[PDB]
Structure 1
């Protein structure tokens, strides 16, 4: 078996000539030559089985990406693992080889307005399909957006994705939350579990801002700091938006803050297209019920050169899990990963 930067890729014989790309807490991504399709691909080695949360993330990714088929969502071409549960220590997810992701890209490249507009269009087009399946991505951020050599963009990961559940969204002040801090909507810190589509729109808003300046717009350094970053730019919420926050601990926290004015988008982004800032304002709206929805956003004048709802497809049916994966043991999740991957056997 080939070995890359310290560990084995049991991906042969179909996939050969591996090259290292990157790694995470419990896996490693390489490129490899697909001997059948005669193209280089990406292979992600995933070793999740020692931990329930790793097993959850892995299963959500596999289950959703296998059901979805959309030009702006990464597909799963193949999955490699051992023929039996006992022998399965890892799973390899094979995908189209992309050139970069938006995180790496923003570290190193200035985007033309044309690129910003095209990237944002593609994010929203992919998100339309996701939301049409009643699915929330819940962790949109630059590193979960892949780009190929011609700047086609594909949303990836889905390890924290859930079925939307607006009737169970309300929670108390400072409720624990998992998704990446800088892309969290203000209501996460106030009264929301992140069970509605508006949570993803906020993240897209943050991504747009970050494309405009190459810097995260709300780089909070801890849970509550995130909210104060948002408020430092948005300013104090209006009386109407406060009256939508019925939980007293959350409302009284906001009431305790000195009056802060809104920082105008054109002072933060003086070189940006004025239509881009108008859409930005609507995505980064404090009140989640007033925040623009994805199909509304696609119809915004900033995107008029791309907008074509007949070319912005939706899912054939809503997505549902067999059961909630929230409280299932890792051994049970391994079973489901095994079953969910059987179709590529062998």
Structure 2
């Protein structure tokens, strides 16, 4: 049929295996289409990426592929297949094939009230995938509703691991310690994000929607109030600590005034996730065992990674041509 299929001007060269192309999205260098996998007789999502001229875009691509080839968990989108040219010279583009999901949490939150069972079930599933990621000693680092994919039966998968890193322990879902001291290197960063997502499910409305960089921190303290003395001591960067002190006092807005209609158990969980001090922040295993998730919590049915990562390339500084090379090698699993 014709030649290489074309979607909105962009070449989508996915051989005869995948046909019936239909546009879904365009997150910069990466267009997402749905397709029909003629081998497996299913419909799939296919992401086209062209990272090879940007070290950063190569690092995200390598990281995502490396991680996701190694992960196997129901609440994490897996990689079915990767398509690419037989020679690194001709490898200009990379197509990642994954399960077609039906919607995402962001989309879903702009159209629907979530019943408490649903919020509970989505939360559960987020935390279940998170437990597996963290057992692998990996930080997602970019949890937000658009990275939470949903099917018609409410199965939830975590997506986009391009910012993931081996733990070294949008702006709206960023832990405050990332704004404050180092480049945020604890698992509690992900828990924070999940608190933001929880709050968003409770009200259909982002909890800390900072319009600019320092505003994000004002939204956070607007709600949690000024950090306590002990909490100030965890900000160990000179300029951040002093900045915190230069801020006018702020009251802690109680959770039931922001969410008058929420399950009080959900709000208790929310509190522990949206804890300023990262050391006092609830961890994933305790989050799952919280009373709020009582009906889904099943630790015999919450797999962990068999072995934790410890990255065989981290601190990169690798040139693009080198990253491309590893991307070529890691994508080789899938070549004829």
TM bracket, shorter-chain basis: over 0.9
- The structural deviation recorded for 1:320 is 2.8
Deviations 1:165-213 (A, max 9, x none): 11xxxxxxxxxxxxx2111111112113211101100000000001111
- The structural deviation recorded for 1:248 is 3.1
CA contact (8 A) 1:20 1:30 kept: yes
Deviations 1:107-159 (A, max 9, x none): 22221111100000000000000000110000000111111111100011111
Deviations 1:257-295 (A, max 9, x none): 222111111111111111111000000001100000000
CA contact (8 A) 1:266 1:272 kept: yes
CA contact (8 A) 2:81 2:96 kept: yes
For normalisation by structure 1, the TM-score amounts to: 0.94
Deviations 1:209-263 (A, max 9, x none): 0111111100112221111110000001112211232333222211122221111
CA contact (8 A) 2:191 2:284 kept: yes
Deviations 1:284-322 (A, max 9, x none): 001100000000000000000011111111000011332
Deviations 1:47-74 (A, max 9, x none): 1111111111111110000000001000
Instruction: Show the counterpart of 1:33.
Output: 36
Could you list the runs of 4 or more consecutive aligned residues of structure 1 that deviate by over 3 angstroms after TM superposition? Answer: none
- The structural deviation recorded for 1:325 is 5.4
- More displaced 10-residue stretch of structure 1: 250-259 or 320-329: 320-329
Counterpart of 1:244 (choices 234, 241, 250) is 234
Cα gap change, 1:247 to 1:2, in 2 (>3 Å): closer
Instruction: Show the counterpart of 2:211.
Output: 221
Deviations 1:56-95 (A, max 9, x none): 1111110000000001000000011011101111010000
**Aligned to 2:309, what secondary structure does the other structure show?**
coil
CA contact (8 A) 1:56 1:325 kept: no
CA contact (8 A) 2:104 2:145 kept: yes
Counterpart of 2:193 (choices 190, 200, 203) is 203
- More displaced 10-residue stretch of structure 1: 50-59 or 316-325: 316-325
- The structural deviation recorded for 1:326 is 3.5
Cα gap change, 1:232 to 1:11, in 2 (>3 Å): same
For normalisation by structure 2, the TM-score amounts to: 0.97
Cα gap change, 1:33 to 1:246, in 2 (>3 Å): closer
CA contact (8 A) 2:177 2:235 kept: no
Instruction: Show the counterpart of 1:231.
Output: 221
- Aligned partners of 1:329 and 1:84: how far apart in 2? 19
Count of aligned pairs: 333
- Aligned partners of 1:30 and 1:245: how far apart in 2? 44
Instruction: Show the counterpart of 1:121.
Output: 124
**Aligned to 2:110, what secondary structure does the other structure show?**
helix
